[PDB]
Amino acid sequence: KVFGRCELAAAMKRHGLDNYRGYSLGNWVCAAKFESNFNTQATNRNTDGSTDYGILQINSRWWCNDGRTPGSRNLCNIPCSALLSSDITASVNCAKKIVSDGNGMNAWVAWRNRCKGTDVQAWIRGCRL
Ligand SMILES: [Cl-]
Ligand code: NA
């Protein structure tokens, strides 16, 4: 499913992401936009053989199991395919674990290079939340 800007904003807020670990909703919507262009089905292969899945492009090297990433962990205890659903519950729950890992949202490369330091509030502007 391809989410609308405000539609996703509302969905994330309901799932407890607004201000989670100090990160305002705008940060999460910005990351989603640049990681997957709001597409829950987005998949991207990495050089090391791992693959990124879903709306927030979670990596199979450490967070989910896709059966084709040798020596990987699966810290979120879930099939990577579950991160491609129209329902973002699985992605959100796993992202909460990731952002709490120690490096915050820097774990998401696109957020660091395109969201960090910007006026992220612009991403939820005009939204009925
Ligand atoms: Cl943190
Ligand atoms: Na894995």
Curated annotation (Swiss-Prot):
Its main location: secreted. The keyword Flavoprotein does not apply. GO terms for molecular function: beta-N-acetylglucosaminidase activity; identical protein binding; lysozyme activity. The active site is at residues 35, 52. Pfam families: Lys. PROSITE patterns: GLYCOSYL_HYDROL_F22_1 (PS00128), GLYCOSYL_HYDROL_F22_2 (PS51348). Residues 1-129 form the C-type lysozyme domain. Its EC number is 3.2.1.17. InterPro entries: Glyco_hydro_22 (IPR001916), Glyco_hydro_22_CS (IPR019799), Glyco_hydro_22_lys (IPR000974), Lysozyme-like_dom_sf (IPR023346). It is found in: Secreted. Disulfide bonds join 6-127, 30-115, 64-80, 76-94. Gene3D superfamilies: 1.10.530.10. CDD domains: LYZ_C (cd16897). The keyword Disulfide bond applies. One of its GO terms (biological process) is defense response to Gram-negative bacterium. GO terms for cellular component: cytoplasm; endoplasmic reticulum; extracellular space. PANTHER family: LYSOZYME C. Lysozymes have primarily a bacteriolytic function; those in tissues and body fluids are associated with the monocyte-macrophage system and enhance the activity of immunoagents. Has bacteriolytic activity against M.luteus. Lysozyme C is capable of both hydrolysis and transglycosylation; it also shows a slight esterase activity. It acts rapidly on both peptide-substituted and unsubstituted peptidoglycan, and slowly on chitin oligosaccharides. Monomer. Belongs to the glycosyl hydrolase 22 family. This is Lysozyme C. It comes from Gallus gallus.
